[PDB]
Every structure is written in C-alpha cells, then in structure tokens.
Amino acid sequence: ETIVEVDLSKEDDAFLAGHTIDGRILFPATGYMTLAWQTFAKMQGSEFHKTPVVMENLVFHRATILNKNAVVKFGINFFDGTGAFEICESGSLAVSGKITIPESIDNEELPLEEQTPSAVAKELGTNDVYKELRLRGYDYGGIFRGIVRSDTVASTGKLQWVDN
Amino acid sequence: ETIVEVDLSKEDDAFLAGHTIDGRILFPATGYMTLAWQTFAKMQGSEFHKTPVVMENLVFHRATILNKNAVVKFGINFFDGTGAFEICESGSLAVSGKITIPESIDNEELPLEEQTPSAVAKELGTNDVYKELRLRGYDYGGIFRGIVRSDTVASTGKLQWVDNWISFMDTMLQFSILSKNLRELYLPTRIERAVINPAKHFELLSALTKEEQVETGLPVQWYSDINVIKSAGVELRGLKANLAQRRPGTQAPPTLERYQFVPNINTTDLNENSEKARLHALDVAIQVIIENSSGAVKLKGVELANGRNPDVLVANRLLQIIEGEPVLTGDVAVVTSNNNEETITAALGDSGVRVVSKDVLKEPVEQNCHFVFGIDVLSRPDTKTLENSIASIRENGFLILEETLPTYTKTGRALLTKFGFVAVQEQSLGATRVLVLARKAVDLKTRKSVVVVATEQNFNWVDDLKAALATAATEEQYVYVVCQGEELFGAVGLMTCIKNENGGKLARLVFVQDAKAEKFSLTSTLYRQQLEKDLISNVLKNGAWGTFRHLKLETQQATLQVEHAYVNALVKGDLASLKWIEAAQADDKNLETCTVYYAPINFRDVMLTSGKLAADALPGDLAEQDCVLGLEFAGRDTQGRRVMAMVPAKSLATTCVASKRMMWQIPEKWTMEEASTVPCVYSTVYYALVVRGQMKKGEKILIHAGSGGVGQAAISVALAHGLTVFTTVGSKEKREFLLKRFPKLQERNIGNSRDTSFEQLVLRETKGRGVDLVLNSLSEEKLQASIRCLGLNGRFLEIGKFDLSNNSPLGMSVFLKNTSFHGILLDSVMEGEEEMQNQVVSLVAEGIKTGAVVPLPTSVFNDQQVEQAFRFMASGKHIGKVVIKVRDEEAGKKALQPKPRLINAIPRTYMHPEKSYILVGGLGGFGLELTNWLVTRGARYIVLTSRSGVKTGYQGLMIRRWQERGVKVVIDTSDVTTAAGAKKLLENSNKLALVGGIFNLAAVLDPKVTATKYLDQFSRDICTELDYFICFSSVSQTNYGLANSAMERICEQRQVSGFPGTAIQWHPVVASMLEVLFQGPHPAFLYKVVSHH
Amino acid sequence: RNIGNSRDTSFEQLVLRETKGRGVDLVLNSLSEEKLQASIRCLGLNGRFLEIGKFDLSNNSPLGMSVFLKNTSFHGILLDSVME
Ligand SMILES: [Br-]
Ligand SMILES: [Br-]
C-alpha cells in the first residue's frame, strides 16, 4: 500500500483546519477523494491536475478526527483489475470506492445547461450562506468558506477558486 | 502488488500440465486459491502450511490457458481494510475473493460425520472415474488423477495425498463434478466458503503411511443438501460450476463406403449422375491397381494432359484416392508436351501434384510408374503416344485409358492387342465413352504353379496355404487359392487374409460363388483369359468375372421428404448448422398433438443456438433432449380447430404436443401469422405486471426495449390499464414506430436504450419522484440506472438474465424505499404448479377481448429460410415477432382438417420403444457406448451378453443411469457360442420384448464366428420383428481375418434369403459412426468405415 | 428440530437439512451481514424474502442477484411507509 502523511503544522496541509465540524476538525470526504485521485495519477505516471478520472461507488465509512498537531498517516491501495481502492487511517478502513481513467472524459459528463436563478426571494451572500450553516453545526473557516453567492433555494450559485 | 511467476519448464510447476481440460492446459482454480493462500501467509510472517485461513466469495472470472513453455505472471493484491484480494494474469482480472486468518480455525468448520457409502451399484475405481470424466472433456493426468475411489453416486470416496495442495483440492472439485447428472464439461465459477486447516490436515495424514496416503487416500464427502465438499483439513461450501465452451474439434465425421461386385466388363454406369459415375470408375481403377501392387507403400502415377484444360485434369482426384488408402502415399505428376508448365502448376493448387515437362511423342514421360492415365490415347493417329506410355510403366504396371466407345471398339482393342496388352477392366462412362484398365498379360503355361483347395471340409487348409507360401518363394512358383461354392468365406475378407500372409504376394484368389462350374483349371477357356490378367482377386458371379470394390457414399447431408421433422442446431457456433431433422413417430393425459403452421423464434432460441446460454439452464430435462427449439406456435388442433399455444420447447417442428391449460382458441379476424405472436410475450407481460407487480391504474411504469416483443406487449397492456408509460428505444426508426402505433404515448417519455440517459429523463419528468414499476431487460450500468428510477413503494421486474447469471451485486439501499425486486422466469410458470398457469392464460384470454392484447408486426420466413430468420433476429433491427411459416394457412380462416405435407429434412432412424436389442459382448467398451446411443434413439429394452458379468464400476454406472432413465437392462451370462445357448438367448429376449435388433461385437477385448452363425440361424425362426443384424469388427492374426470373412458371408447370405444383415468394418468415434450408419437407409451387406479423426 | 441459533450461521445447515435442499417459501429476516447472506441461501424456488432489518439497507450492502434466478422476490418492508 501507499502511505500518505498530512501534517496540519505544515504549510501545505494547514488549510485542513478550516473544515471544522461541530467544534472538531474532520478530514473532508473530498480530502480522501483528492488523495485517492492524486496517488492514482502518481502510479499511472501523470500529474493529477493533468489526469482526468471517474470515481464510482464512493463510500465514507466513518469520520476522521484530527487534533491541532494532526500528524496522520493514510494508507491507500488499488486493484489493477477492477480499479477498486481503499483508504485506511489508524488501522481501520475509512473510505472505499472505484476509480478509472475514462476513454473520453467529455462523454462521461452530462449534457446540462445552467439553470435560471430563482427569483422567489433575495440571493444569499457569503455571510448569509455561512451564517445559516454555522447554525446547523458547520464551523467552516479559511478557504473552506468558498461559497461566494447562492440563490434562495440553492439551485444555482458561485464558488471561489484558490487552487485547491 | 505481489508478482508470482509460474513456468511449466521448471520442476516445481511441471505438475500443472496434468490439469488438462478439453485438450488444453488450464491453471486450476485451486491453483489460484493456493497462490492467494501462500502469499497471504508470507506477508503475515508465517509459513502457509502453518497458517490456517478462510476464503470467502471466491470468483473465478476467466480461465487461464498455459502453453508448453508457459511463462505466465500472476499479480496478487490485498486490502488491509476488508481483506478482499485479487489475482491478475495478463493485465486482466482472473480471480477475486476475501481471505482472513480466523480466531479459531476449529470454530469455523462444520461438525459433519461420514456418510454411509451408496450400494445401489458397484463403486467406481480410479480408472472408472477418469474414464467417465474423459468423456466429459476432462483430460486429467499425473497427480491430478488423485481420485482413488468413489461410490456410484459420488457421495463418498477417497483422495490420495502427494504433498500437493493444488492437486488435492482440485480432486475435491473433480469429485463434486462426478455427482452432476449432465455429462458435460463444467468449470468452477464460484465458491462461497473455503476453510483450510493445515494443522488438522497433517495430524490426520500422520495416521497414514506414505504408501497409504497414495494407495488408499483420504476420505472425501459430498453433502448435497447443504452443498459442502469436505475432506480432511479442507472444507468447501457453496460450489458453483458453469458449463464451458468446447473447442470446435478438428475431428471430421466418419464416412461410409459400401462394398459391391463390379464386373471387369461393366456396361452399366456406377452412378446415375454421369460426373459421379466417372469419379467412381476412377476410384475402382486405382483400387484394382493398389490391390495388385503387392506390398507397395508408395504408388507412382502420371496424367497425360496434351490438348486439355488445366482444370479438368483428374490428377488431384487420383492422388486423393491413393493418399486415402492407409499406410500409402502417392507420387502423382502431370505431364505436358505443350510447355505450359506455369499455367498447369497453378491449376493443381495445394494438392501436391508435381509437374514434369516432356513431349510424350518419341520419349518416355517417366520410369517405373504403377499407372499412366490418358484420354483418347487409342484414338490418336500415331501409336507413339501409346508406345512411350508403355515404356513408362513397370512391367506389371497398368494403363488407365478413357476412350470414346465407337473408336475403342473398331480399332481400340486391336491396338491394345497389337502392343501385347489386355483389357483388364472396361467400365462405361455413359454411352460413347468407356474407361479401360489395361495390363500386359502373363503366360500361365510357362510359370510354375500349385493350387490350394481352401474348403470348409478341410479344417487345416490354412496350414496348407502357409506351407505353400513359404515353399512358393523357394520353388519360384505362384499359389492359386481356389474357393468354389463355400459358405462362411466372404471374398473380401478371405482376400485380405491371404494378402497379409508371409509370401502373400505370390497368391492368387479364385472365388467362384456358383458351385456348378468348370473345375479350376489354367487350360479351361473360362478361366484362362481371366487368370492371364494375373489379378490377385478373381470373383465369378453369374458368369461374369469381377472384384468387390468399395464406393464412396453421397449422403453426407442428403435430404429426404419426411412427414415429421424438427429444427436442430448441429454445431452451436455456426448458425448455418440449423437444419430440419426427421423426428421419431409417436407411440394422453391433459395433452394435445397439434399441427404447427407458425412457429416464432424467441431470444431463448437464439441464445441457446449461439451458445451464450448453456443447456443446464433449460427447464427440466431438456439438456438431454435433441428437439428443444420452439417456445410457442399457432396451428391446428387434433380436431382441426384454430389454436395458438405456449410450450417449454419443441414448437419449432411440423407437430407439437401442447398442454390444454396453456392454449387459446384463435379468434376471428386473426391470421395464424398474427396469433402466433401473442402467447409468450403476453403471458410474460401479464405474469410480470399484473400477477407479480400488481400494477394499478394511474401508476407510472418504465418499460425498457419499447419496440421489442415484450415491450410492445407491455406498453399495450399498461396503457390499457391506464398507467403512465415511459420507454426506451434502440434507434430513430424504433422511436418513430412506437409513437405512431400507440394511444397517448408522449415523446417526452421516450428515452434512449443505448445509454443511461433515460435516468435523467425519467427523474426529470417525474420531478425526482420516479416510477412505481420497472420492467427491465437491460443489464449492468443500465440496470443500476434503472434502479435509480424506482420511486417509493416501487416494484422492480427483472426479465433479463445477464446480471442474474453473473450474480452481479445489488445495492440494497434501494430497499429502504419499501420496494420489491422480482426475478421473473416464465419457464418457472410452465415448469411450476398448475393454478398459476391457468391464471396467466385467463389474463391473456380476458385481455384479447378487451383489446389490450394485439398481435405484433411479423417478419415471416419460410421453412427454408430458418438460418436467415435466426441471423435476422440476432441483428436486432427487427421490430415485433420473428415467425417461421411451416405451413400456409388454409383460406377462410375457419376450422379444417389439414392436408398432408412433406418437408425436406435430414433422415434419421430411431429405435422401437417396444422392442428388445441384444448386444453380444455388450459390456465391453464399444458395447456400452453403443447401448447408450440406442437408448437416446428410443431403445427401452436392452440385453447384454457377458460371460464375466459386471466387472467395472463404470459398467454398473451406465446400467444404473439407463435403469434410472427407465430402461430394462438384462445381463445374460449364458454361453451363446453353442446352438442351445444362442437359441435360449433369443427366446428369452423375445419374451421380454420382441427383438428388433441383434448386434455382434468382435471389437471388444472361432467363438466369434459360431455365435453369429447360430444367432443368424435361430433368429430367422424366433425373431419375426428383427430390423437389424449387424456385425462390428476391424480389418485384418490370420484367424481374425477369417472371422471377418465369415461374418461378411453370413450377412450376405442373410440378405439373399431376405433378412437384414450388415457387416461394419473399421469412445467419441462410436456415436459419430452410428449416426452416419442410421442416417437414412443402408441396405448393403458390407460397409467400410473411414475415420477422419 | 426446527429451532436454530441466531448467534451464528449454523441455522443455514439446519434448515437445508430439514428441507432436503428445497429451502423455505418465505423468510422474515431481522438479522444482518453474514447471517443475512445465509438466510438468502435458505430461500427456495419461488421464495419470497421479507426484510425488516435496517443495517444492510442503510449500509447499502451488496446483494448477489443470482438468488433471483430461482424466480424469487426480495421485499423491503417499512411499516412507516404504510402510515405515511
Ligand atoms: Br466531510
Ligand atoms: Br479449474
């Protein structure tokens, strides 16, 4: 298996503290997806930002809690045969699923056009959005506060991009 | 991942060659398990023989074939999280499953006690077991032949131990396959659980000697109720095996050649067809030459081709006849005087006939030939062509000359006489043409000779001949064997018997049927001209000298007009094999024999024919049956009523027996063509949507494959009940057809079946709600997508087979929605209870009047276009039902008794189900397989004569199988060689059931002669319903040859006196030969079997 | 003879032995995981499995669709669905 270490004391992984849920840091589901994505490109030979993929049947078996120091090791493994992967943290399965490099990445997408924003009520600002979420228990911080705008029903909106 | 390389060139992996399946080495399923077991223990730190494990959900996705060199790399990987593992070989998945080291290996096993061995029939020995398996396709060898013992049903047995887990665990799988009733090739697909306990294994082995471990072995158990194979430390639960594809064997079927008397001077064409007649003439000619070339291993010949088309030359055919003869090769060349070598060479092709360049005028074409073929050689103005042809053959060589009859008569014979040649044979080639075989004569006066009596009154005449043959060489003389008016001496057999004797080249057979004829004498005018030809075989029959020659039969695939027939796919891979076959006649209950007019093809017929679907899947005992095609039909009742029906099989025939419960009387304004489309698709639709699914008005249903047979029927009924319908289609044209054909079908509701797009469409149109029912025939990603279309309280109706067969995984989250998943097999209905059958037909019955049941569009094909019919449905461009027009419907569409018809089908002879069949030496290898074949052809009373009785477990096995199939088997252990014994056998057998056939077997391994002689004699009086009297044997010991000669004469004599009699002269081969023999009439008294295996 | 143990998978053997491989016509199941898969194997031809548990449903456990070759039915049963 491939071992991947993330340390929130380190500059590259520090942002993860922003994904705080109910007063504790949780390794985000999308964190696992990225780690699985990245390493998969590594063994395939390419750079992950140049490598399109299709993940299937993703299962997040449990939440991963980190402290402030948060030096945590993730173990990743892939089956050449089916593309099935598994990520284990602290001696127990965390996430499982399937990953494949498609024939045509464009054909794997859906023919969807943008929706017309809802005009039933005023649109939400970044502060409106995360005020709502805070009340639900989500304590997002830093770059994880990336919803700049959303319509009243959250059918359409905008997300910022910080190369992450 | 861990890479493991196995090389059969190395000593450690060499044994794997023993696991040969269907003529190829396969990496055993148990091989994979061992690899997974070993490597897994290694990384855990332990030794694998010290490490107990539990494997689960083993799947063997594909077979691994190895060559001789066989360098193959296996890649293994393990998940720390779940314990799932995978084995890859050539960049593709091979095996998958789960493996874990248990807390307590003892706790993981089942507390099972040994079973009491079955005593229903004799137990099987190691040789019995693997004889059985060989017939199925398993070619096990070496240590993989580890089944020392098994009971007749394979419930208990023993396996040897040679310190090899792969072989040992494999024999456990072999053992499980034994118990399977169908005798076909099975390969492992899945194993639910495999418990391996090494500690327990070796402490059990310690109780055995290294010899006992090999000679006696370990107990193996098969518990059919719980599905477990248990032996020592290995415990296997939930084994699943699937029927595997058999390689298209390179064994051509055997041909039959009939013997007959051919006069040297034959003015009758050997065949009706002039072209075939000529070929036979050439065949006879070469035969005579071979017969008179002493012990020649090579036969040299040439063909003169001056002024002829390169295509019409016969050289290839000649070499083909020569090469055909066993242990004989030919040197055939084409001689050309017109120096057009390049042109000629191309015409011959890949035959291997060389070409020589010489001008036949003034010079010899070649030296020491056995024969020279030419056309119009005696016609030519100059004799130079003839002269150099004579100089080209060896002294005793022949000339094959095709001539025009008028010319050959007025000058042709004189020219041969002029050059000292005699016409050995003259065969007509129609009128105006003749084939002449010429040879230099020999002088009977100048050469020393002695005569041998060869009569039955002198028992020692064989020694007289042998003594004469040895003396002949020394004394420089020729021996004339004279056999005048003698019984039990067939000319063909006796000739062969002489030829193979030491110094046999010096013998000449003079065979005279009529006992009233001039005594043998070189001087007699009758004999002199004939014996001056110096032929080794001379047969006098009705005043004419001749020989017995074997002619190639024309019917490899001949078609006779029969009254009853069915369609069969002879070889599954090729659909061209679809042909009509003559059916057996009928000898009740709630059954009705109907006349078939229209028989539709359904996907099940296509799948079966193509091989995508195995035979074991077929409901009931159809895997055994030959006639299985045809699921439904429209036709006429026993009383001429217009009827449409549904059956499990056998509707694709001129007649079908249908169940009254599953029949509808065709309504008016329905053509039989139309009606034929209704039974299956609508019975399916109603059993799925109404019975199982319980669809209600106003509900939403997703019908996949809208413009298909089941789809169209589904859409019609659904819309009739008032449901909102969503569908999918394969193409633009299919879309257009549905829209125009149905009441309120919304374009918004038609998706695409080629992809998963329909998921978005349905969810969009249902605003995320989904539908209440799904009728699915799609598979894989399209199935899971269809699942996502299911709304609250939904009910999934599967009518496909792929994912079910493959045991695909189904996400059980769908069931949170209070849903139901329904596996729907219509076959289970017909195979199942009665009330369900009566309900579904009621639904269909009620539906027709309502108008919900509409006949489908038809793509009709006649009885000759069955191939095109199948290929057309396979393509998938068709809309509606594909129907075969067996009979044109009578005008008026009213009830009417049918006119008789005949259909061209391959003829086939079946046994009589109320007659007995005696097989002398019936328990030998040949006998057993012959008996089996007779049983499959309808024989239900079998008598086997055996002095020793049942000796092998295999024998007891076959008898058990025949008796279970309802066959009466009698083992007669009495001495049949005597007259009283033969008489008794026939009288007892006849009282059991009237004897229909007697089969004499000298092939198993004189008394051979005397039994046949007496059986022949007394059967004439006793067996008044005997249809067959057949004697099997091989060609050419001197006493065996004489036994053949005797059997030949017996059968000939029988026919003379108006009795059946056939001598057959030469275990997959037996069945193949028997099929040909009984494929149509075969009335000749002697046949030659040519093997092409 | 007809009372098995819910703590292990042994009830599979007991049932198949008593039904001689036929299985049962219905299964009312509240067990999960390896005991669920074992209960499936107890399902006979035309059988009808009746699930009232939630683990495998919530966890989206995989179900081998081979069982449906036997012309069977799997029923997700939520009483709540009735009242709502
Ligand atoms: Br998360
Ligand atoms: Br295998």
SS (H, E, C) B770-802: CEEEEEECCCCHHHHHHHCCEEEEEEEEECCCH
Burial of B268 by CB count in 10 Å (0-12 exposed, 13-18 middle, 19+ buried)? exposed
| Inter-residue contact B773 to B693 (CB < 8 Å) | yes
Question: Which two structure tokens, joined as six digits, stand for B24?
Answer: 């190829």
Query: B80–A96: do the CB atoms touch at under 8 Å?
Result: no
| Inter-residue contact B511 to B1048 (CB < 8 Å) | no
| Inter-residue contact C57 to C51 (CB < 8 Å) | yes
Residues of A in CB contact (< 8 Å) with B are 1, 75, 77-82, 84, 86, 88, 92-93, 96, 110
Separation in Å, CA of B910 to nearest CA in chain C: 36
Test mutation, B778, B795, B798, B815, chain C, max C CBs within 10 A: B815
- Containing H/E element for B591? strand B591-601
Strand positions, DSSP E, B839-967: 858-862, 881-885, 903-905, 916-920, 941-945
The CA A41 to ligand 1 mean position distance, Å, reads: 23
Select from C18, C60, C20, C69 the least CA-distant residue to C40: C69
Rg (alpha carbons) of chain B, rounded to whole number: 36
Strand partners, B236: B194, B229
Which-ligand-closest: CA of B94? 2
Select from B485, B511, B493, B425 the least CA-distant residue to B259: B493
| Distance between first and last Cα of chain A | 25
Separation in Å, CA of B77 to nearest CA in chain A: 7
Query: C74–B821: do the CB atoms touch at under 8 Å?
Result: yes
Query: B81–A86: do the CB atoms touch at under 8 Å?
Result: yes
Contacts of B821 in chain C (CB under 8 A): 68, 73-74
Strand partners, B303: B334, B373
Out of B1, B82, B91, whose CB is closest to A93?
B82
Select from C41, C45, C80, C46 the least CA-distant residue to C63: C41
Out of A79, A80, A88, whose CB is closest to B81?
A88
Determine the residue of chain C that is closest to B692 in CA distance. Answer: C73
| Inter-residue contact B330 to B319 (CB < 8 Å) | yes
Q: Is B755 a catalytic residue?
A: no
Domain A2-164 has CATH 1.10.3720.10: no
Amino acid at A96: S
Q: Give the torsion sign (CA, B201, B202, B206, B210).
A: positive
Query: A80–B77: do the CB atoms touch at under 8 Å?
Result: yes
| Inter-residue contact B945 to B972 (CB < 8 Å) | yes
Question: Would you kindly state where each structural domain of chain A is located, as residue ranges?
Answer: 2-164
Question: Which two structure tokens, joined as six digits, stand for B432?
Answer: 């105006």
Distance (Å, rounded) from C-alpha B496 to C-alpha B490?
Answer: 10
Query: B226–C70: do the CB atoms touch at under 8 Å?
Result: no
Q: Report helix angle B834-850 to B679-686, nearest 10.
A: 110
Inter-chain contacts counted by CB atoms under 8 A, chains A and B: 38
Question: Which two structure tokens, joined as six digits, stand for B32?
Answer: 């994979």
Q: What is the dihedral of CA B217, B222, B223, B224, to 10 degrees?
A: -170
Select from B708, B707, B715, B664 the least CA-distant residue to B689: B715
Separation in Å, CA of C22 to nearest CA in chain B: 8
| Inter-residue contact C38 to C44 (CB < 8 Å) | no
Contacts of B96 in chain C (CB under 8 A): none
Rg (alpha carbons) of chain C, rounded to whole number: 13
User: Which residues does B947 contact at the CB level (< 8 Å), separation at least 6?
Assistant: B973, B975
Separation in Å, CA of C12 to nearest CA in chain B: 8
Cα separations in angstroms, C6 against B812, C3, C10, C54: 22, 10, 8, 17
Distance (Å, rounded) from C-alpha B183 to C-alpha B155?
Answer: 17
Phi, psi of B236 (to 5 degrees): -115, 120
- Containing H/E element for B166? helix B165-178
- Containing H/E element for A78? strand A71-78
- DSSP string computed for B293-314: SSS-SEEEEEEE-TTS-TTT--
Half-sphere exposure in the Cβ direction for B346 (13 Å, CA): 4
**Active-site residue identified among A6, A16, A19, A151:** A19
**Residue pointed to by tokens 């998945």:** B93
Select from B1029, B969, B1033 the least CA-distant residue to B999: B1029
The CA B785 to ligand 1 mean position distance, Å, reads: 26
- DSSP string computed for B57-93: EEEE-S--EE-SS-EEEEEEEE-TTT-EEEEESSSSE
Test mutation, C31, C34, C65, chain B, max B CBs within 10 A: C65
Distance (Å, rounded) from C-alpha B35 to C-alpha B78?
Answer: 12
| CATH superfamily, with its number, for domain B2-243 | Polyketide synthase dehydratase (3.10.129.110)
- Containing H/E element for B498? helix B491-499
| Inter-residue contact B951 to B959 (CB < 8 Å) | no
Rg (alpha carbons) of chain A, rounded to whole number: 18
Burial of B119 by CB count in 10 Å (0-12 exposed, 13-18 middle, 19+ buried)? exposed
| Inter-residue contact B260 to B538 (CB < 8 Å) | no
Contacts of C36 in chain B (CB under 8 A): none
The CA A148 to ligand 1 mean position distance, Å, reads: 20
DSSP annotation of B653 reads B
| Inter-residue contact B342 to B270 (CB < 8 Å) | no
Q: Is B878 a catalytic residue?
A: no
Separation in Å, CA of B663 to nearest CA in chain A: 48
The CA B217 to ligand 2 mean position distance, Å, reads: 22
Chains that contact A by 3+ CB pairs under 8 Å?
B
**Active-site residue identified among B19, B721, B878, B912:** B19
Distance (Å, rounded) from C-alpha B809 to C-alpha B555?
Answer: 52
Question: Which two structure tokens, joined as six digits, stand for B897?
Answer: 């008794």
Distance (Å, rounded) from C-alpha A138 to C-alpha B904?
Answer: 81
Contacts of B825 in chain C (CB under 8 A): 69, 71
Select from B672, B682, B631, B635 the least CA-distant residue to B652: B631
Distance (Å, rounded) from C-alpha B63 to C-alpha B817?
Answer: 40
Question: Which two structure tokens, joined as six digits, stand for B457?
Answer: 């009154």
Determine how β-strand B771-776 pairs with β-strand B24-26.
unpaired
Separation in Å, CA of B103 to nearest CA in chain A: 18
Contacts of C21 in chain B (CB under 8 A): 224-227
Strand ranges of the sheet holding B820-823, from the earlier edge strand across to the other edge: B750-752, B724-729, B700-703, B771-776, B790-798, B820-823, C73-76, C43-51, C24-29
Contacts of A81 in chain B (CB under 8 A): 86, 88, 92-94, 96
CB atoms within 10 A of CB A86: 23
Distance (Å, rounded) from C-alpha B320 to C-alpha B300?
Answer: 13
Select from B275, B337, B258, B330 the least CA-distant residue to B298: B330
Distance (Å, rounded) from C-alpha B511 to C-alpha B261?
Answer: 12
Determine how β-strand B421-428 pairs with β-strand B265-266.
parallel
Cα separations in angstroms, B30 against B169, B190, B199, B244, B1028: 6, 12, 19, 17, 50
Cα separations in angstroms, B1013 against B441, B768, B1004, B1049: 41, 87, 18, 10
Helix/strand/coil for B1050: helix
